[PDB]
């Protein structure tokens, strides 16, 4: 056994004194974030159109040209036109009696043109309901057969059909609400909110003033039930060159909003640090980030829905959970969050604690940054709280153990100083140190008996050793941890049953009845551990693959009919099926 050295240091007497470090100032725990309990309503940018109901009144005018051959008949042309019903026929025939006259009279291609149904005299025809289709709105018409002229052989003849159609349609408008489109596909180049009264004349129109009338005190008569309505309304009636549309006039402000309510958060926590507010919601797992200054709702164009929906939702959420435990402090506050979110926040305070330029906000489509800000902060605050508690406990343990190190210096100053300097040293209020030389190739005697005085016998093994090989064998005595002392001064009385292990160079030497028996390895004695185990493993690497529930090619294929692809096929028809180059003379 030679993996361990041996050591000789003299008596420590010198100016090299050393002291232990005194207790350190342990760190203070971080105080913690102060929150404000509160109620929030979160708003996004409105992307939905403004939707309203309208009624179309038009006449399908059809004039056909038939040539009558000997055996057959051939259409030579079919002319289809859409004629608007006049204002006076909507009010005094259709809304009044449920009838429409059999003559269309209208201006077309800068000419007043008239058309009689079946080329017959004018009569009033009853509007009857249309044939039912699924997922269609209601409709009414006057005739269901086309009129074609009767046969006179080898002549061209003409026949006119007039069908008065009334249709209910859905109408859609998008900001700045200068136009709207109907369910037919027909644009109307007038604001839905246009009118002659109540200041509405500032709204857009691109039609002449004789095309627009308003009827106050309008009572709608249902065309199926034949029932007149009980409450009046103001109707806008606009005659276009193809149809006349009718709709209710409403004021623009309580109908339209630039924002729309997205989330109602009953428990919204507000924290202030770093010159910002952090609005955390534990239910939807988001944190929003805003500046300290509130946002003025006078900066939002068409933003009257925001204060209405906020005050209504806050009062429900206060009257559902916070009824007996909290009070509202102040009025609702408005904040613009990063990503384009408007937050209406109502601060609360518990009953225990109560001792004393116009513009458009653009929202992002991905809330994932706010949900990553939540999950990061929730893990960060927990790992900083736990590792800070370990750091205050590690400092307190290392200060508490210093008392055990002061009582152990006086017992064994050799081993305590050699454990706190970093090198084996000798030591003997301060402590004075000395560095040993390191010898090896030591021989041990076989007798622990003092021959001079037979009634005594040495406690520790006798050794003989050499500093280097050119030096004499120095007589000494084996000490603690392979320290070979220079004096033979460890005496003790001789007893019975004497049995000893002593550490001798990487293994134990065994003496029985003051006589050398045999040397051992350390792998012979049973090892007990002073140590407390702690098996910390590392967190392994993980790879995040791209993952989507629908690719962008899937969301575009979800539509039934693609306008770019149908027009690309249809306009290639003469390049596939005709010849556009040849001219016959």
């Amino acid at each position, epitope marked *: 056994n030679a993996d361990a050295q041996f050591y000789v240091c003299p008596p420590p007497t010198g100016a090299t004194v050393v002291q232990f470090e005194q207790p350190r100032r342990c760190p203070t725990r971080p105080e913690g974030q102060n929150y404000t309990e509160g109620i929030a309503v979160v708003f996004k940018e409105n992307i939905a159109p403004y939707k309203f109901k309208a009624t179309m009144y038009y006449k399908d005018v059809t004039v056909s040209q038939v040539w009558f051959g000997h055996r057959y008949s051939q259409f030579m042309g079919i002319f289809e036109d859409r004629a608007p019903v006049p204002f006076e026929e909507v009010i*005094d025939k259709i809304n009044a009696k449920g009838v429409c006259r059999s003559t269309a009279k209208y201006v077309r291609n800068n000419m007043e043109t008239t058309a009689f149904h079946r080329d017959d005299h004018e009569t009033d025809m009853e509007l009857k309901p249309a044939k039912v289709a699924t997922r269609t709105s209601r409709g009414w018409h006057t005739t269901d057969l086309k009129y074609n002229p009767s046969r006179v052989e080898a002549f061209h003849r003409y026949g006119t059909t007039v069908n008065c159609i009334v249709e209910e349609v859905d109408a859609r408008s998008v900001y700045p609400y200068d136009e709207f489109v109907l369910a037919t596909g027909d644009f109307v180049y007038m604001s839905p909110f246009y*009118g*002659y009264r109540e200041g509405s*004349h500032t709204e857009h129109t691109s039609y002449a003033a004789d095309r627009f009338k*308003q009827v106050d*005190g309008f*009572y709608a008569r249902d065309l199926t039930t034949k029932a007149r309505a009980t409450s009046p309304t103001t109707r806008n009636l606009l005659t276009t060159p193809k149809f006349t549309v009718a709709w209710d006039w409403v004021p623009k402000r309580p109908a339209v909003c630039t924002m729309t309510k997205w989330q109602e958060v009953d428990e919204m926590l507000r924290a202030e640090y770093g010159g910002s507010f952090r609005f955390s919601s534990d239910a939807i797992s988001t944190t929003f980030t805003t500046n300290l200054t509130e946002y003025s709702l006078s900066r939002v164009d068409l933003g009257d829905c925001i204060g209405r929906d906020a005050r209504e939702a806050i009062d429900r959420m206060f009257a559902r959970k916070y009824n007996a435990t909290h009070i509202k402090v102040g009025q609702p506050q408005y904040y613009l969050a990063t990503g384009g979110f408007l937050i209406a926040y109502q601060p609360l305070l518990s009953n225990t604690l109560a001792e004393l330029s116009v513009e458009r906000i653009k929202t992002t489509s991905s809330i994932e940054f706010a949900r990553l800000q939540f999950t990061y902060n929730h893990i960060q605050r927990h790992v900083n709280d736990m590792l800070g508690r370990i750091a205050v406990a590690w400092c307190e343990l290392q200060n508490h153990e210093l008392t055990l190190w002061n009582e152990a210096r006086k017992l064994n100053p050799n081993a305590i100083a050699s454990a706190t300097v970093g090198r084996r040293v000798s030591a003997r209020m301060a402590v004075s140190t000395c560095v040993p030389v390191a010898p090896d190739n030591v021989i041990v005697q076989n007798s622990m008996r003092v021959s001079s005085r037979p009634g005594t016998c040495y406690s520790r093994p006798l050794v003989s050793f050499r500093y280097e090989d050119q030096g004499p064998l120095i007589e000494g005595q084996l000490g603690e941890n392979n320290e070979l002392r220079l004096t033979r001064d460890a005496l003790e009385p001789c007893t019975v049953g004497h049995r000893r292990y002593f550490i001798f160079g990487g293994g134990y030497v065994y003496f029985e009845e003051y006589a050398y028996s045999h040397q051992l390895s350390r792998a012979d004695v049973t090892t007990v551990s002073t140590f407390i185990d702690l098996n910390i493993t590392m967190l392994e690497d993980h790879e995040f693959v791209p993952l989507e529930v629908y690719t962008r090619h899937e969301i575009k294929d979800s539509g039934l009919l693609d306008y770019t692809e149908v027009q690309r096929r249809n306009q290639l028809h003469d390049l596939r099926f005709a010849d556009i180059d040849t001219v016959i003379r």
Partner: antibody
Amino acid sequence: EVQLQQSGPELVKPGASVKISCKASGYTFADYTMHWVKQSHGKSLEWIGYINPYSLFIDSNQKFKNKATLTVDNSSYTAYMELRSLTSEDSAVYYCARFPPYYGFDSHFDYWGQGTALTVSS
Amino acid sequence: QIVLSQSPAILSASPGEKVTMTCRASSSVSYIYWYQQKPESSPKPWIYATSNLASGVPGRFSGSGSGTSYSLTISRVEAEDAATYYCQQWSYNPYTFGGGTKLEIRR
């Protein structure tokens, strides 16, 4: 031609009620609105309100809510204005006027009555 | 109630002179409407839809304006053109009339 014959009781007691009429002739009485205005001693013209003889819809000045009520006689082609609780400031010339039953650019008082002159005194 | 201040309160004119009378509104109105009242007689329609001339009025009258500012002009003033002229609006409830502008002829 179009004429609005307007006659009513002209001398009345304070704290009473009077009914002015405006007989219409020369046009269909049911497809125009009948309006009423007030001209006190040449100071201004104040609009009272109107009535549609067909749908019986009424839109009125809120200044005259506790003062005037409007009605029609469809069989007689006459409109009526009833002025209750007559004080002396009600003494004025009251006119009747024709107007279209819609709001266009053309819509204006195109025919008038001659005016009944009311006097609240003793 | 919307107000129609109608300046001047009284204007004097010599026969042949071009004169003008204004009507300015408190809020914006869609159209303006003019009426003529001679004493012991009803008002008669004079100018409708800010520019159009009523049935039987002379071509020497013209109107102009939009929004909150309106005007009535005579190219050469005759002696029968001597009455009060009222501007009125119906864009708001109630319909209101202006204060009137009295036209006096010089001799």
